[PDB]
Design a protein around this ligand. Structure first.
Ligand SMILES: NCCNS(=O)(=O)c1ccc(-c2ccc(CSc3nc4c(c(=O)[nH]3)CCC4)cc2)cc1
Ligand SMILES: [Ca+2]
Ligand SMILES: [Ca+2]
Ligand SMILES: [Zn+2]
Ligand SMILES: [Zn+2]
Length: 161
């Protein structure tokens, strides 16, 4: 046995938005991020506008209400908790960073896909070409294809769709 969600139908809520991007650009970016995993697993993700959801996403700075505070510009950038109740599964992004949909700063989609991998029970990868490798890089690929090391890893938890 490993650590994982018992249900295949998960809900997320975007609690607050970063000033660095428009509501629509944020929402598009996170939705594409969950799709990364939904496409290769039986998992399904639906967004809630209110109330408590399984994966609760928020932006914040410094001491933000958990034992893992951010540090301002540079340094740490996001973290997410493994599956479980309450804080379990949630994702936090440091809003002293610069979030973008481009080549500049941290690309919010890529970092969300990474952080959501942790939310589903994945650990970091040893393959520098994985999405779950602990070092951020931006490859500027024409379109994004989820690398094989990570499709293997998430499927070990949930199986193919
Ligand atoms: N517990 C340590 C936390 N350190 S952290 O907060 O500073 C941190 C560090 C790195 C990442 C992070 C690392 C890698 C990625 C993904 S990199 C990437 N993968 C792929 C492509 C690409 O262009 N870039 C193409 C396909 C796979 C995202 C976030 C997140 C938080
Ligand atoms: Ca930081
Ligand atoms: Ca939660
Ligand atoms: Zn946090
Ligand atoms: Zn990570």
């Amino acid at each position: 046995r490993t650590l994982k969600w018992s249900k295949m139908n998960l809900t997320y809520r975007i609690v607050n938005y970063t000033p660095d991007m428009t509501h629509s650009e944020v929402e598009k970016a996170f939705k594409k991020a969950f799709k990364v995993w939904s496409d290769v697993t039986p998992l399904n993700f639906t967004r809630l506008h209110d109330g408590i959801a399984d994966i609760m996403i928020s932006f914040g700075i410094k001491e933000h209400g958990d034992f893992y505070p951010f540090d301002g510009p540079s340094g740490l950038l996001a973290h997410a908790f493994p599956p479980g109740p309450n804080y379990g599964g949630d994702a936090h992004f440091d809003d002293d960073e610069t979030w973008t949909s481009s080549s500049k700063g941290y690309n919010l989609f890529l970092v969300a896909a990474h952080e959501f991998g942790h939310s589903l029970g994945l650990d970091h990868s040893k393959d520098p070409g994985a999405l779950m490798f602990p070092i951020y890089t931006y490859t500027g690929k024409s379109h994004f294809m989820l690398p094989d090391d990570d499709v293997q890893g998430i499927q070990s938890l949930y199986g193919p769709g």
